[PDB]
Amino acid sequence: MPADTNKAFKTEWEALELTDHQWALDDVEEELMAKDLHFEGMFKKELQTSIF
């Protein structure tokens, strides 16, 4: 509601420049060396349910 659009715009404009960038997608190697066992305890409990 408050009418202080100019100062809010300037503050957001400077805050956006103050942000850096750190791509969290580069850390992919963590998943490759791992174990997939949840996907069958999960898959065992999906089988019993039938189709209505």
Next chain:
Amino acid sequence: GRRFKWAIELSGPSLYPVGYLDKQVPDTSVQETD
């Protein structure tokens, strides 16, 4: 390539899009620590 045999290929033939920019405008480098 023929090694995959089946190879489906898809080709693509006013600036209304909100953020999609025709010009790339790289060369941003900000180092401010106050």
Next chain:
Amino acid sequence: AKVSELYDVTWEEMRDKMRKWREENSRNSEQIVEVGEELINEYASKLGDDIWIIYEQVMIAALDYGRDDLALFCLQELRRQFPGSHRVKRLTGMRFEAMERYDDAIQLYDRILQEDPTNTAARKRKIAIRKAQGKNVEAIRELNEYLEQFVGDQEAWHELAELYINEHDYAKAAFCLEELMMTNPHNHLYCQQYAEVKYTQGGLENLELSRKYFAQALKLNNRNMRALFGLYMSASHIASNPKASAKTKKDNMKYASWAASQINRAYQFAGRSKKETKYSLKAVEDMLETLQITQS
């Protein structure tokens, strides 16, 4: 089975199941109508607040299925309780567009806009009307204008992406899905669709980006096999292309080989469920062996 299903059931379970259906916003207009008039004629006692949404959902389903009689039957009941309500007007305009004379529903929408300036539903319905009336380009233009005027709706973003899919415009759809992924980073489905769109674009760098986003959504849920298939195919394709480094080729080959073992075991422990799963297991086994000989 109709009478059998109608025997072992209570009205509370019916209402809870329809509430779950509304939560999942699924398409079961046949079943929604089938249970709709049943609770209307069996209980018809209480839960008026629930029964209003019940009526609206039932007529929404009936407009789709085969029945305008029940649609008008619920419209008159909705008009009886609320004399002036914009939701009933929007629903009536939708039914009018369904029947004939789209222009009347049109001026109904402009009167609704004249009364209430902020009405997203009416503008969305007009946009959908011109989506099917004229070409999709004009509808895209109006959707972009409305998305400028609000910049609030994720459904508008997804509809724009779906409309751009038919036009083979993956450059703009990439931005659309990036924006949609911004608000919901824990939704692996949008990540999978974005990786799909990026893979379809082509290019080695796009292939690597699509592979890494396929891998990110693979660890978030561990439920989807589409993402692992896409990752394995991306690795195989990057192996195929001669323009690559040696070490990246080795690690991508390792990624593909590990995905192959994951496929093998996932189909393996699925074989104990039924007795016909062995044929699917051997089919996928020869598939993976052939692609392994191809890669090696």
Next chain:
Amino acid sequence: PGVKLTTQAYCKMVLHGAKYPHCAVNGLLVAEKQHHTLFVDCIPLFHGTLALAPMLEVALTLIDSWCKDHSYVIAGYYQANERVKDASPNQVAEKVASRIAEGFSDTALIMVDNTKFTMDCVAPTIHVYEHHENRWRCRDPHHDYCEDWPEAQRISASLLDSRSYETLVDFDNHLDDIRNDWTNPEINKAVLHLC
């Protein structure tokens, strides 16, 4: 060259279209390679956006893996549009048709109509397009592609009247539900029993 299909494949195609009457449907017909073109059966590929090749990549590769197991071959690919007033093949359909025509020398494109798509079907309600690598795009005016029209009509009416077409499964459902197959066993048993 005449076109001929078994009522099982036509019933599968119609039922796959009925399963998702709101989005476009896709299917793959299968023939036998050892002049008339005989079709054996059809498998439903996908539904929904229906504009994605890499999923079609896995689908077609697994389809080939199955054809080299029971000594089969892929003949043609069929696609139905979403809008009722639309009977024109799309670019992706033509691309898939050319991909199949590179291997096989006979691929017919089957467009399923929406205008004459009701409970009591007349009979053919199928558009057959003959496409190649050149600019030859011709649609056959009207011929006979099925064996027993009255019997096929009876089985189709019985299948549509009785609500037993929810068991029909898709390739997408196979990925979502590994439990569900994609060869339609119950459908095969039903069509065999009806005859």
